[PDB]
Design an enzyme around this catalytic site. Sequence first.
Site, PDB file in Angstrom:
ATOM      1  N   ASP A  16       0.755  -1.231   0.000  1.00 15.45           N
ATOM      2  CA  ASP A  16       0.000   0.000   0.000  1.00 15.45           C
ATOM      3  C   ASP A  16       0.797   1.300   0.000  1.00 15.45           C
ATOM      4  O   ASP A  16       0.215   2.335   0.177  1.00 15.45           O
ATOM      5  CB  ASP A  16      -1.032   0.037   1.097  1.00 15.45           C
ATOM      6  N   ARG A  30       0.834   6.871  -0.018  1.00 13.15           N
ATOM      7  CA  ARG A  30       0.092   5.860   0.679  1.00 13.15           C
ATOM      8  C   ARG A  30      -1.296   5.767   0.035  1.00 13.15           C
ATOM      9  O   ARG A  30      -1.957   6.735  -0.126  1.00 13.15           O
ATOM     10  CB  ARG A  30      -0.063   6.353   2.108  1.00 13.15           C
ATOM     11  N   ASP A  35      -6.086  -1.049   3.541  1.00 13.17           N
ATOM     12  CA  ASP A  35      -4.994  -1.593   4.324  1.00 13.17           C
ATOM     13  C   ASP A  35      -4.635  -2.912   3.782  1.00 13.17           C
ATOM     14  O   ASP A  35      -5.504  -3.771   3.700  1.00 13.17           O
ATOM     15  CB  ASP A  35      -5.418  -1.807   5.746  1.00 13.17           C
ATOM     16  N   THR A  36      -3.384  -3.061   3.375  1.00 15.04           N
ATOM     17  CA  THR A  36      -2.834  -4.332   2.931  1.00 15.04           C
ATOM     18  C   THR A  36      -2.111  -4.987   4.061  1.00 15.04           C
ATOM     19  O   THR A  36      -1.608  -4.309   4.948  1.00 15.04           O
ATOM     20  CB  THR A  36      -1.853  -4.218   1.759  1.00 15.04           C
ATOM     21  N   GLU A  38       1.114  -6.438   5.897  1.00 14.53           N
ATOM     22  CA  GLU A  38       2.408  -5.780   5.772  1.00 14.53           C
ATOM     23  C   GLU A  38       3.577  -6.733   5.755  1.00 14.53           C
ATOM     24  O   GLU A  38       3.451  -7.825   6.220  1.00 14.53           O
ATOM     25  CB  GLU A  38       2.551  -4.621   6.745  1.00 14.53           C
ATOM     26  N   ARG A  82       3.600  11.339   3.712  1.00 17.33           N
ATOM     27  CA  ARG A  82       3.139  10.553   2.501  1.00 17.33           C
ATOM     28  C   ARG A  82       1.905  11.224   1.800  1.00 17.33           C
ATOM     29  O   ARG A  82       0.948  11.596   2.482  1.00 17.33           O
ATOM     30  CB  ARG A  82       2.792   9.111   2.932  1.00 17.33           C
TER      31      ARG A  82
END
Length: 136
Positions: A16, A30, A35-36, A38, A82
Site C-alpha cells: 500500500d 500511501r 490496508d494491505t 504488511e 506521505r
Amino acid sequence: KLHKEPATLIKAIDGDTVKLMYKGQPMTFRLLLVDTPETKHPKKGVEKYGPEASAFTKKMVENAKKVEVEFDKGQRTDKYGRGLAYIYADGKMLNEALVRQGLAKVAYVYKPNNTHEQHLRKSEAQAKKEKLNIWS
C-alpha cells in the site's frame, strides 16, 4: 471535483505504499482507504498475504504504460509526509484492484477523504463472497 495527474514510478515499497516522481519531486504515496497486510509492519513485521499484496502492487505499477494520481477533497498528505491518493495504472485504480482480489481491506475512513469509499466497499463485499485470499 477530482482530477488525475501524471506521475512516474520510482519504486514500489509495500502493498500500500509506492514512491513516485510527482511534479518533478520524489514522493512517497500511501493508497487511500485500503490496508494491505504488511511485510514491514512496525510491530508484526511479515503478515500473511503481505508478500502477495506487495507483489501485486509491484507488478501492476511496473508494467503500466501510464500512472496517474488522484487526490481526494481533504488533506493531501498524512503526518509522515506521505501523499494520500487513489493511484491508477492504465486507468484501473490500484486501490480497488487490491480490494477486489482480497489482498486489502477497506480502511477506517476519515471524511472528507472518502470519495470512492462506496465503490471500494462494493469490491470488498465481492471479494468476501468469493472467499479470496484474506477472506479464504
